[PDB]
A paper describes a structure:
[name]/Mta interacts with [name] RNA via a region termed the Mta responsive element (MRE), stabilizing the transcript and supporting nuclear accumulation. The C-terminal IHD of hvsORF57 forms a compact homo dimer, approximately 65  ×  60  ×  40 Å.
However only the hvsORF57Δ146 construct produced diffracting crystals. Each polypeptide chain is composed of 11 α-helices and a small β-sheet formed by two parallel strands, folded into an individual globular domain. One CHCC zinc finger is formed by each chain from residues C293, H385, C389 and C394, which coordinate a zinc ion in a tetrahedral geometry. Residues 181–417 form the globular folded core domain preceded by residues 146–180, which comprise an extended N-terminal arm largely lacking secondary structure that domain swaps, wrapping around the dimeric partner's globular domain. The major homo-dimer interface is linear and formed by contacts between α-helices 3, 5 and 11 which lie approximately parallel to each other making symmetric contacts and forming a groove. The groove is bridged by α-helix 6, where residues Y311 and S315 from separate polypeptide chains contact each other, with the sidechain hydroxyl oxygens of the Y311 pair distanced by 2.6 Å. Analysis of the surface electrostatic distribution indicated that the groove has a net positive charge.
Author numbering:
A (entry chain B): 145 to 417
B (entry chain A): 147 to 417
Write the structure that this text describes.
């Protein structure tokens, strides 16, 4: 029919000088952390900066003796919103290298909770666990950006599972529905396994007593994880893909998604075997 | 009780992995231009330099357009440039998204001014990243605390939600244009989405979708250079001064970021 007005002109700001920056709230000063442990303080100092990820490597069988010391910051920091905001900034702008590093860190950390019989619950504050939902969303976003030969050229692609889990998370952050969907099938694709690993902690933290069965499935996934699995799975899958994919352009699209290197701002450690 | 996973999908334990593999780039070829300004612009484009140093006023872009085409449209290094830009966009905070959006819209306006056609085949390193940019803008909007959409004079919250759903769920670009053209735009967030959709939608319109194409052209023609940065700056400034939530400030900082990554950005157009 007739052409309609596009938009209310009052939406536009008053003319002025070019805007070259976006404003961000000024950050209140941080309090001193509540520990005198110089190893823990050193680890926090290094988490604040984008250190080369090889420097942040931590052998996972040494993590149990570091867990309770590091809790003095990870659980008990008086700077909770500062730390979570720093980690969310890195995750929200993360390439797949960065996503993978953060996922291995968060799963190894969650296994320490399991080893010490700590419960998972969104009430108690934990700067690592409380960014696991943002990390799941970022992983789904990276998977959706990959050329779809990455999922189709697996031995058992299970592409309908990849698509539906990604849909559930990307459309409406339907985390528990993604767990319900994943538990109806044996996992046979490494991409599906990455999704299962990424969903297990964000789901466990929001389960209530009525979702005890889903919680038990998340605990099964967490127990089967082994330190370094996320990086190991991606390293293998990406190498195999370069050795078999006939597309002229897939490698250029993939390199952009994977990125040149990880950003470790807010990352305390990269756990490895 | 169902087995959890086939153990054969797990890789052989070997070396600790401290990086993810990507192949090395070949040597790039010389760009097809001797124009000193354009070659200087390309050298700056390769680095993450302060964005104040890529500023380009609206009176200067029209004359530099045809010179810049020698790279943007006719480079022998198309995959180098596009993959560099897609890498920045795929890891972008909102500062970076905003800069690249203004760049793409001003570039698209120069296409219109010169009666060029929009299509997927025409190789253009700026327009061929506009769909990635739209997806990234939607991703940022969805992470913002919702006080950002609700605290507008006319939030149109249902429009923001549906457009974000269409793009994030299945990249339904033309359906998003169809939905947007049913209503007058009254929220700055909806206007940003409309600006971000118009070039990706124009590029994939066929002969059966000339009415949608025409709507994209109205949006592109009404855009004013710098609008994306100006709108976001005003809106973020008002929200800081009026939102009472402490959690919102910290979350907003994380999404917005503290500076842009200009790697692959050729220019930041302004008034
Ligand atoms: Zn491929
Ligand atoms: Zn707010």
């Amino acid at each position: 029919g007739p052409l309609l007005k596009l938009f209310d002109i009052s939406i536009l700001p008053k003319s002025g000088e070019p805007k070259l920056f976006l404003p961000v709230p000024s950050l209140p000063c941080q309090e001193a952390e509540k520990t005198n442990d110089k190893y823990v303080l050193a680890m926090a100092q290094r988490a604040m900066h984008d250190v080369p990820i090889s420097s942040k490597q931590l052998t996972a069988n040494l993590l149990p003796v570091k867990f309770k010391p590091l809790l003095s910051i990870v659980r008990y920091t008086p700077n909770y919103y500062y730390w979570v905001s720093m980690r969310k900034e890195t995750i929200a702008s993360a390439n797949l290298c960065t996503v993978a590093a953060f996922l291995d860190e968060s799963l190894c950390w969650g296994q320490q909770y399991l080893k010490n019989d700590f419960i998972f619950s969104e009430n108690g504050k934990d700067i690592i666990l409380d960014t696991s939902s943002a990390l799941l969303s970022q992983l789904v976003h990276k998977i959706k950006m990959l050329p779809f030969c990455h999922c189709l050229m697996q031995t058992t692609p299970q592409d309908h599972i990849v698509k539906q889990v990604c849909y559930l998370i990307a459309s409406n952050n339907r985390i528990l529905d993604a767990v319900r969907y994943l538990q109806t099938s044996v996992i046979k694709s490494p991409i599906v396994l990455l999704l299962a690993y990424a969903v297990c902690l964000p789901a466990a933290i929001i389960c209530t007593k009525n979702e005890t069965q889903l919680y038990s499935h998340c605990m099964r996934i967490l127990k089967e994880y082994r330190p370094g699995d996320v990086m190991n799975i991606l390293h293998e899958s990406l190498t195999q893909h370069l050795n078999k994919c006939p597309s002229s352009t897939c490698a250029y699209t993939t390199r952009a998604i994977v990125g040149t290197k990880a950003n470790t701002t807010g990352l305390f450690f990269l756990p490895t075997q």
